[PDB]
Amino acid sequence: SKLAGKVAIVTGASKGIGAAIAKALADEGAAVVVNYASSKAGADAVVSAITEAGGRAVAVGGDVSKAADAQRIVDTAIETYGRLDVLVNNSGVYEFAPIEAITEEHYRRQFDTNVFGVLLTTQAAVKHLGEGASIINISSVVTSITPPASAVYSGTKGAVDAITGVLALELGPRKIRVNAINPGMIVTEGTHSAGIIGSDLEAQVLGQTPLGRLGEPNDIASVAVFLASDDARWMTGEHLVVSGGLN
Amino acid sequence: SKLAGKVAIVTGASKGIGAAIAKALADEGAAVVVNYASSKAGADAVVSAITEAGGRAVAVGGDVSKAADAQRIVDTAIETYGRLDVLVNNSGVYEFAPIEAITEEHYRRQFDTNVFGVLLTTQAAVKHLGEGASIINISSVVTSITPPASAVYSGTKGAVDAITGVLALELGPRKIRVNAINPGMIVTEGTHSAGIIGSDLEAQVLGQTPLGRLGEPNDIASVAVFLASDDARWMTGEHLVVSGGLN
Amino acid sequence: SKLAGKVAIVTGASKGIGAAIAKALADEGAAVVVNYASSKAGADAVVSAITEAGGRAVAVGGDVSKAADAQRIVDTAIETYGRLDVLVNNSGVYEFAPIEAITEEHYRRQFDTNVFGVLLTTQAAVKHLGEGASIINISSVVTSITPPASAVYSGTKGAVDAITGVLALELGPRKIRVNAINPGMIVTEGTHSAGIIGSDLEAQVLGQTPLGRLGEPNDIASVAVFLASDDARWMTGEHLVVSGGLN
Amino acid sequence: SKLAGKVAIVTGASKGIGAAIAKALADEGAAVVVNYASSKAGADAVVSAITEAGGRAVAVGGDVSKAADAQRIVDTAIETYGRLDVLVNNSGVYEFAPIEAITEEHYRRQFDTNVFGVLLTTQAAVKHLGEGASIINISSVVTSITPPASAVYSGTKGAVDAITGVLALELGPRKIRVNAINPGMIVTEGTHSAGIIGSDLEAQVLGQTPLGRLGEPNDIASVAVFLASDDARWMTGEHLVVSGGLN
Ligand SMILES: NC(=O)c1ccc[n+]([C@@H]2O[C@H](COP(=O)([O-])OP(=O)(O)OC[C@H]3O[C@@H](n4cnc5c(N)ncnc54)[C@H](OP(=O)(O)O)[C@@H]3O)[C@@H](O)[C@H]2O)c1
Ligand SMILES: NC(=O)c1ccc[n+]([C@@H]2O[C@H](COP(=O)([O-])OP(=O)(O)OC[C@H]3O[C@@H](n4cnc5c(N)ncnc54)[C@H](OP(=O)(O)O)[C@@H]3O)[C@@H](O)[C@H]2O)c1
Numbered sequence: 008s009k010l011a012g013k014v015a016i017v018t019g020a021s022k023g024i025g026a027a028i029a030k031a032l033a034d035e036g037a038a039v040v041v042n043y044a045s046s047k048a049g050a051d052a053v054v055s056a057i058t059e060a061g062g063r064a065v066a067v068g069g070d071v072s073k074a075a076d077a078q079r080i081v082d083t084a085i086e087t088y089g090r091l092d093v094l095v096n097n098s099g100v101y102e103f104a105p106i107e108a109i110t111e112e113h114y115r116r117q118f119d120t121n122v123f124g125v126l127l128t129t130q131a132a133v134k135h136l137g138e139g140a141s142i143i144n145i146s147s148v149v150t151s152i153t154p155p156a157s158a159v160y161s162g163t164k165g166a167v168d169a170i171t172g173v174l175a176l177e178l179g180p181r182k183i184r185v186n187a188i189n190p191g192m193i194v195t196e197g198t199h200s201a202g203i204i205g206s207d208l209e210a211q212v213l214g215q216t217p218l219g220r221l222g223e224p225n226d227i228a229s230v231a232v233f234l235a236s237d238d239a240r241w242m243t244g245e246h247l248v249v250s251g252g253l254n
Numbered sequence: 255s256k257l258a259g260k261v262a263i264v265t266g267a268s269k270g271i272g273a274a275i276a277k278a279l280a281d282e283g284a285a286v287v288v289n290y291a292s293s294k295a296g297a298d299a300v301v302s303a304i305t306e307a308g309g310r311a312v313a314v315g316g317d318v319s320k321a322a323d324a325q326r327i328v329d330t331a332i333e334t335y336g337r338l339d340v341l342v343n344n345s346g347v348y349e350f351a352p353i354e355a356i357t358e359e360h361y362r363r364q365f366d367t368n369v370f371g372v373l374l375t376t377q378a379a380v381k382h383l384g385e386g387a388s389i390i391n392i393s394s395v396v397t398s399i400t401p402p403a404s405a406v407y408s409g410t411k412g413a414v415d416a417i418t419g420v421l422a423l424e425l426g427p428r429k430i431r432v433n434a435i436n437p438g439m440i441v442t443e444g445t446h447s448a449g450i451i452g453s454d455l456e457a458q459v460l461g462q463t464p465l466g467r468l469g470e471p472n473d474i475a476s477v478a479v480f481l482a483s484d485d486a487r488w489m490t491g492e493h494l495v496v497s498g499g500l501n
Numbered sequence: 502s503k504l505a506g507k508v509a510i511v512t513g514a515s516k517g518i519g520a521a522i523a524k525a526l527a528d529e530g531a532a533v534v535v536n537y538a539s540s541k542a543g544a545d546a547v548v549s550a551i552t553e554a555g556g557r558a559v560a561v562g563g564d565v566s567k568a569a570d571a572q573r574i575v576d577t578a579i580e581t582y583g584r585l586d587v588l589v590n591n592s593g594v595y596e597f598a599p600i601e602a603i604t605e606e607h608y609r610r611q612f613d614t615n616v617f618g619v620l621l622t623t624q625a626a627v628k629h630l631g632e633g634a635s636i637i638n639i640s641s642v643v644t645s646i647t648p649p650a651s652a653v654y655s656g657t658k659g660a661v662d663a664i665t666g667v668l669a670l671e672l673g674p675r676k677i678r679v680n681a682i683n684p685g686m687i688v689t690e691g692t693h694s695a696g697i698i699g700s701d702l703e704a705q706v707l708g709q710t711p712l713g714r715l716g717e718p719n720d721i722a723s724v725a726v727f728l729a730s731d732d733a734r735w736m737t738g739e740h741l742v743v744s745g746g747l748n
Numbered sequence: 749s750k751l752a753g754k755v756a757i758v759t760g761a762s763k764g765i766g767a768a769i770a771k772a773l774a775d776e777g778a779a780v781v782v783n784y785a786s787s788k789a790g791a792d793a794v795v796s797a798i799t800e801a802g803g804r805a806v807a808v809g810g811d812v813s814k815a816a817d818a819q820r821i822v823d824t825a826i827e828t829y830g831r832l833d834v835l836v837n838n839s840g841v842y843e844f845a846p847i848e849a850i851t852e853e854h855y856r857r858q859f860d861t862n863v864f865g866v867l868l869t870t871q872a873a874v875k876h877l878g879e880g881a882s883i884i885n886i887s888s889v890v891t892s893i894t895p896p897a898s899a900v901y902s903g904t905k906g907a908v909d910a911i912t913g914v915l916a917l918e919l920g921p922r923k924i925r926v927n928a929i930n931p932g933m934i935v936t937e938g939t940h941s942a943g944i945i946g947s948d949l950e951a952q953v954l955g956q957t958p959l960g961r962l963g964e965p966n967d968i969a970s971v972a973v974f975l976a977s978d979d980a981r982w983m984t985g986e987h988l989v990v991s992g993g994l995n
């Protein structure tokens with residue numbers, strides 16, 4: 008197993024991409040801290056799937072944008088399993104608005120979760136990360152295709168791309184790798200809830216996807232396993248677009 | 255003259271890159287709104303430079319991260335000159351800190367000015383922008399070279415890069431252009447005050463700059479004039495690295 | 502004038518983008534060597550346009566893929582005007598073919614002109630260049646959007662992009678700047694002759710162009726003048742996409 | 749296993765990166781066509797290492813820059829194993845020269861092998877490729893870092909990057925994936941023979957490598973296995989820099 012004996016944290020693993028990543032890491036032997044914000048039921052369902060398949064996982068509720076919660080998410084890994092090897096910064100929210108319609112709350116909610124939450128959780132985790140550890144930030148293909156009416160959200164993911172590059176260099180001497188995955192449109196709880204599935208944006212994106220379908224959470228999960236594993240030992244500071252060819 | 259009859263706003267034009275951009279735009283015929291935050295005297299010096307050279311300019315105090323001040327900056331253009339053609343989002347602050355040392359205040363001050371202030375000032379300006387308008391965002395070469403210990407600052411400029419691309423697509427149908435300049439290290443009031451001139455970072459940047467010197471504010475100002483002018487009429491969504499070849 | 506007393510070579514200036522660049526450089530005071538391959542009549546017409554407008558120019562026939570012709574083009578600058586300041590590597594050809602249909606002739610004709618010709622002309626020219634010289638390579642937005650059935654042509658322009666970056670670093674110590682322009686679809690003699698204007702690809706590109714039209718040669722010419730001038734003194738190794746926002 | 753039942757061609761598998769890729773693909777169950785140009789003994793040793801580990805392989809001599817040899821390499825897969833699933837275009841040569849030292853042979857040798865050979869081998873292969881096939885082009889991090897005195901070699905790899913993007917779009921409807929790996933400096937027989945090991949470039953590269961060593965063939969081979977496998981099913985048109993963090 009590619010991650011035998013390792014411990015991973017996946018933020019926002021009660022739904023969507025994060026849930027798929029948690030299950031996939033556990034399938035390769037990692038014990039997984041499954042973080043949720045509002046959906047304990049979703050996280051418990053993911054933990055039960057992992058444990059019924061023979062793996063180890065534990066649920067932890069916490070808002071990554073709150074310093075004490077980010078710390079407690081990380082402490083859960085150390086207290087439960089004694090070590091930390093892999094951090095997947097997946098928690099994230101998205102809302103579109105044209106420039107005229109942007110409000111302060113629309114801006115702060117997305118930047119606080121999608122950027123400050125990445126920084127706070129990584130800051131808490133790095134004390135426990137040693138040579139060969141792997142930090143995986145879930146960014147978005149919007150940093151390449153920058154759709155209209157996404158200035159705030161695409162802004163958050165542009166920040167994540169740059170933070171990924173900074174920390175790859177900053178943590179290089181400690182041999183901690185830092186990489187991003189930039190998904191295309193993925194069918195998730197969130198893209199249904201946001202009305203993105205079924206929208207004109209979805210139709211446009213689908214038509215421009217070379218491989219001819221929308222993405223699924225497991226399309227991202229298998230790339231996260233790769234980046235978490237030693238097979239990516241010589242990759243750091245990369246941004247892997249996983250969109251079926253759209254960029 | 256390239257900008258005869260046009261009106262420009264330069265945020266943060268009491269010092270540094272913004273002051274040089276303001277003077278260069280006025281040299282090509284633009285009437286310039288010269289924004290300051292803490293230094294009225296600096297803005298008055300730039301306005302005096304412009305008017306002594308035969309141009310038109312007016313100072314306005316305002317914090318771009320405050321919605322009411324962003325509105326007052328834009329209203330100054332309309333009240334004084336009756337139109338708005340060019341917006342240069344130059345106001346910005348920088349402070350480095352390694353991941354372990356990042357504080358909430360360090361994060362919020364830079365994102366509020368460097369990202370929210372771009373969004374607020376652009377939001378106020380767009381009501382007045384018509385076909386041929388040009389929005390120029392001052393980003394940074396850090397989105398290319400992502401230096402260690404710059405996670406927050408590089409994050410803000412990654413966000414600006416993405417916002418530039420979004421708004422180029424979003425405002426395209428109105429024939430409003432949106433582009434970024436990504437300066438390398440420029441000798442400015444701010445890089446002196448921040449201790450960056452004389453720092454290890456300065457040494458590293460100089461040692462990797464193909465054209466063999468640090469940048470000066472006029473190195474950026476002449477590119478801003480280009481992007482503001484009809485010479486750049488077929489460029490939108492670009493990010494021009496102006497760093498003497500460092501990328 | 503921006504290029505007063507300067508001397509420029511434009512390869513492939515009997516038609517299209519190169520003709521527009523030659524006229525624009527001359528409008529800013531440059532004496533221009535107007536190169537043609539098959540159309541002396543076209544180069545002579547561009548020379549007449551330049552001299553009727555008060556400028557200086559001379560035509561020279563030569564195939565940039567032949568070392569002796571590249572040398573003769575450069576010798577024409579030195580022998581006629583005594584110096585060389587600006588080299589625009591604009592000569593290029595394009596033909597689409599899906600992978601199954603690519604022939605050796607289709608491959609060699611495009612790489613010999615579009616790549617070897619850039620190398621040979623730059624190699625002859627660099628001996629005469631000094632501080633402040635500007636080399637401008639005309640690449641293509643296809644290095645961003647890589648359309649189907651363009652493997653050979655996009656291949657040539659990907660080479661040109663890389664050669665631009667190499668020579669920017671290699672000639673940095675001599676303070677010779679090297680930059681690329683990457684045009685979008687431009688209506689020219691060539692794109693009419695190739696049937697590209699009116700194609701389904703043109704409809705797709707137009708629909709994806711934020712500024713809502715196809716490009717024209719003067720859209721590129723004004724950017725070439727900027728890069729040739731001291732206004733771009735702090736830019737080297739850049740690739741300026743000039744496509745109305747398509748990338 | 750990840751490639752059970754599948755068949756791969758690795759061009760240039762008698763040495764270096766290609767040898768390591770061939771052995772790694774076979775470890776995951778692929779039958780491997782091991783192509784060599786000058787070194788039958790090297791290919792035979794790779795084939796033997798593969799069969800000793802329980803796999804299937806066959807050696808074939810051929811110059812990818814010769815159409816008849818490229819066709820025979822592909823025919824070897826079909827005649828020996830009946831199918832083709834993975835093509836690794838790894839064959840490549842490198843020689844540095846500053847612009848004034850570039851000769852016609854130096855240019856043609858590298859473009860014929862590194863670009864035309866990729867096109868010819870891919871052209872022969874595509875007839876046999878169906879849904880789920882994976883084409884992996886070995887490019888180079890020089891397309892990011894474009895070192896001085898590498899205009900021809902970096903030019904070839906810039907062409908490979910662009911060809912990768914074209915064919916990803918062109919072959920997307922057939923659900924054939926096309927991706928590139930862009931290695932940093934890898935210790936191989938070729939870098940020994942080229943005077944790269946022990947050069948000033950090796951010192952420059954190693955000092956700018958965040959993860960603190962030179963690369964090894966298996967650093968690339970594990971990424972090739974990922975791209976060949978269904979784990980990369982949602983990635984096409986990507987360029988994976990595998991350089992220990994240098995870009
Ligand atoms: N098409 C796409 O789906 C797409 C494309 C590109 C990038 N992305 C990125 O992929 C990531 C996941 O997207 P998704 O579509 O899977 O989202 P989703 O279905 O809406 O799931 C979001 C997950 O993040 C959690 N979360 C949200 N805010 C949080 C906070 N403050 N603290 C902790 N956890 C928080 C949610 O927790 P609860 O549900 O328990 O509250 C949930 O587990 C995000 O970073 C998103 O930006 C998605
Ligand atoms: N090497 C560099 O200098 C460098 C490199 C890359 C990018 N940049 C970017 O270039 C821009 C200018 O940098 P600089 O070095 O010229 O800076 P500077 O010398 O420190 O000048 C900063 C200017 O921004 C104004 N400003 C700051 N906060 C503001 C706020 N909240 N509202 C309105 N105006 C505000 C300042 O006003 P007062 O002084 O009146 O308070 C001043 O006019 C920034 O966006 C920076 O990130 C700089």
Ligand SMILES: NC(=O)c1ccc[n+]([C@@H]2O[C@H](COP(=O)([O-])OP(=O)(O)OC[C@H]3O[C@@H](n4cnc5c(N)ncnc54)[C@H](OP(=O)(O)O)[C@@H]3O)[C@@H](O)[C@H]2O)c1
Pocket residue numbers: 512513514515516517518519536537538539540541543563564565566591592593594595614618639640641642683684685686687688689690691692
């Ligand atoms: N949409 C576009 O038009 C477009 C988009 C992106 C990039 N580009 C690039 O822009 C450049 C100009 O394109 P264009 O559309 O203006 O082409 P064009 O109208 O066909 O004109 C091509 C010019 O190049 C010259 N030329 C061709 N082969 C030559 C050779 N071997 N030696 C010397 N000169 C040679 C031609 O000379 P003669 O006519 O006298 O033989 C002519 O002056 C090319 O590099 C092209 O790849 C064009």
Ligand SMILES: NC(=O)c1ccc[n+]([C@@H]2O[C@H](COP(=O)([O-])OP(=O)(O)OC[C@H]3O[C@@H](n4cnc5c(N)ncnc54)[C@H](OP(=O)(O)O)[C@@H]3O)[C@@H](O)[C@H]2O)c1
Pocket residue numbers: 759760761762763764765766783784785786787788790810811812813838839840841842861865886887888889930931932933934935936937938939
């Ligand atoms: N640092 C690096 O090593 C580095 C970095 C980035 C990219 N790359 C790329 O990685 C690839 C492999 O490099 P390497 O260092 O492993 O090279 P290497 O050790 O020199 O091995 C080259 C291989 O290519 C074969 N080859 C050469 N010309 C050929 C032709 N015309 N037809 C068929 N096969 C041919 C050789 O065959 P014979 O030996 O049997 O003649 C050999 O098997 C190349 O594409 C190179 O550009 C290498």
Ligand SMILES: O=C(O)CC[C@H](CO)C(=O)O
Pocket residue numbers: 101147148149154190191192193198203208212
């Ligand atoms: O536009 C796309 O291709 C994906 C949009 C998706 C949901 O907003 C995201 O990037 O998070």
Ligand SMILES: O=C(O)CC[C@H](CO)C(=O)O
Pocket residue numbers: 348394395396401437438439440445450459
């Ligand atoms: O890294 C450089 O060369 C530039 C640093 C400069 C001041 O922090 C900035 O990007 O604002």
Ligand SMILES: O=C(O)CC[C@H](CO)C(=O)O
Pocket residue numbers: 595641642643648684685686687692697702706
């Ligand atoms: O596809 C586009 O956007 C431009 C195509 C054009 C002619 O082939 C060129 O790149 O030279």
Ligand SMILES: O=C(O)CC[C@H](CO)C(=O)O
Pocket residue numbers: 842888889890895931932933934939944953
């Ligand atoms: O410059 C590097 O980091 C790698 C050089 C290597 C051999 O020339 C190549 O790209 O093929």
Ligand SMILES: [Ca+2]
Pocket residue numbers: 151152153254419748
């Ligand atoms: Ca884009």
Ligand SMILES: [Ca+2]
Pocket residue numbers: 172398399400501995
């Ligand atoms: Ca970089």
Ligand SMILES: [Ca+2]
Pocket residue numbers: 254645646647748913
């Ligand atoms: Ca693309």
Ligand SMILES: [Ca+2]
Pocket residue numbers: 501666892893894995
């Ligand atoms: Ca570079």
Ligand code: NA
Pocket residue numbers: none
């Ligand atoms: Na304080």
Ligand code: NA
Pocket residue numbers: 492493494739740741742
């Ligand atoms: Na660019």
Ligand code: NA
Pocket residue numbers: 245246247986987988989
């Ligand atoms: Na990449």
